Amino acid sequence: EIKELLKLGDLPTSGQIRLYDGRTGEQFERPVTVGYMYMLKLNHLVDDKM
Amino acid sequence: QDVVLGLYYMTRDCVNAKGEGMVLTGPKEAERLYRSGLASLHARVKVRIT
Amino acid sequence: ARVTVQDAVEKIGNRFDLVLVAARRARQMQVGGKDPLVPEENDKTTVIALREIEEGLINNQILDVRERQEQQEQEAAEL
């Protein structure tokens, strides 16, 4: 179903695209898993640690 | 982990890789070919090594 | 500067005696009127000490005879 949803949004069904390096503009030799992960900022902040 | 994976990926060989079979004047020409995109990092090749 | 001390440990045959000799010479150069025997390339007295050890210009025997010499010269002023 994830692959069918990727096909619906005109995306590569393997979940992996080809990226390019930002600094040198040349393509990374293998397809990279790119997507949207739900990240969280946890309460262990380096301001309160140092 | 990242270092070992980089050195493993660099030092492997592929069978019909881009630029297979040529003969190089040394490691510097191999780096030139790889950075120019004229040969892949796994192309089995003949290098003059000192 | 120094990133590894292995050349100094080959002249002074230990690391603990190296630490002691280099601390004595660095205390000479830091608090004391003594001048380095090597060109001070913006180094602190610990690294100048270790660079003098590395070149063979300083060891415990050289430090001892230099102390004897300057003390005998300072005691020679009997007036």
Binding site: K49, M50 | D2 | A1, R2, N42, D43, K44
Partner: protein, 51 residues
């Protein structure tokens, strides 16, 4: 006040001055190692990968 000259002084005083970095539990003696500090602008220490 952290004037601009105390940062030049601070670059002078740490130049060849090692610091010891320690991660507790110090299970063995390599849990305390010395390093020369490179002044960075963060609030987190930058520990070399190989160590």
């Amino acid at each position: 006040r952290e004037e601009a000259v105390v940062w030049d002084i601070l670059d002078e005083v740490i130049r060849e001055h090692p610091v010891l970095l320690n991660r507790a539990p110090t299970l063995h003696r390599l849990g305390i190692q010395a390093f020369e500090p490179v002044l960075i602008e963060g609030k987190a220490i930058q520990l070399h990968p190989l160590v």
